[PDB]
Write a protein that binds this ligand. Structure first.
Ligand SMILES: CN1CN([C@@H]2O[C@H](COP(=O)(O)OP(=O)(O)OP(=O)(O)O)[C@@H](O)[C@H]2O)c2nc(N)[nH]c(=O)c21
Ligand SMILES: [Cl-]
Ligand SMILES: [Cl-]
Ligand SMILES: [Cl-]
Length: 162
């Protein structure tokens, strides 16, 4: 297992290899990130939310999340979206990320991205994409404004009851 964003990730299937890669933000800033290449499935376990995640290289395929309340579920979703390394997440950074402030000198770009969206996730959520759902019993869709829906949801994301 390993820890990212306050969650313990445990791989349940698949595998990956690591390599450094450049990516471009919405403000055309170049970031170097360690990309994981491979299809993998994980459990994500936090103190206030849990999830099942399926991902491929820089793609979130499925996230089923449950938790105490909207704030904890939203935080899990943010951590999963950043962890996915998806282009739409990188492109949702619309101004420059600061690496020079003394308090940011030991954050790698993945952790700079995470902090950015923890401060404010509106642009992330509005640019991720939505899809119609054929709602499954015991689950529900979640919209970009973090309200529930039986008709639409953030792409790949569903909320479960505890
Ligand atoms: C996206 N990540 C990140 N990650 C793991 O999550 C932790 C934090 O990721 P990170 O801070 O970018 O990577 P890390 O290699 O530790 O830092 P650095 O790039 O600065 O050397 C590490 O344990 C890393 O191996 C992952 N592990 C697996 N299996 N699959 C993945 O897609 C990813
Ligand atoms: Cl807690
Ligand atoms: Cl796929
Ligand atoms: Cl939190």
């Amino acid at each position: 297992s390993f820890s990212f964003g306050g969650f313990t990730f445990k791989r349940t299937s698949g595998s990956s290899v690591k390599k450094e890669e450049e990516v471009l933000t919405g403000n055309l800033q170049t970031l170097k990130i360690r990309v994981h290449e491979g299809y993998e499935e994980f459990t994500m376990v936090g103190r206030r939310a849990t999830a099942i995640l399926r991902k491929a290289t820089r793609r979130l395929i499925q996230l089923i999340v449950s938790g105490r309340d909207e704030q904890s579920i939203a935080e899990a979703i943010i951590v999963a979206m950043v962890f996915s390394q998806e282009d739409c997440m990188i492109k949702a950074v619309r101004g420059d990320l600061n690496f020079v402030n003394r308090a940011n000198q030991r954050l790698n770009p993945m952790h700079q991205l995470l902090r950015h969206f923890q401060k404010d996730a509106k642009v992330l959520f509005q640019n991720w994409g939505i899809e119609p759902i054929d709602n499954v019993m015991g689950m529900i869709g979640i919209l970009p404004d973090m309200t529930p829906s039986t008709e639409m949801s953030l792409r790949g994301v569903r909320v479960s009851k505890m």
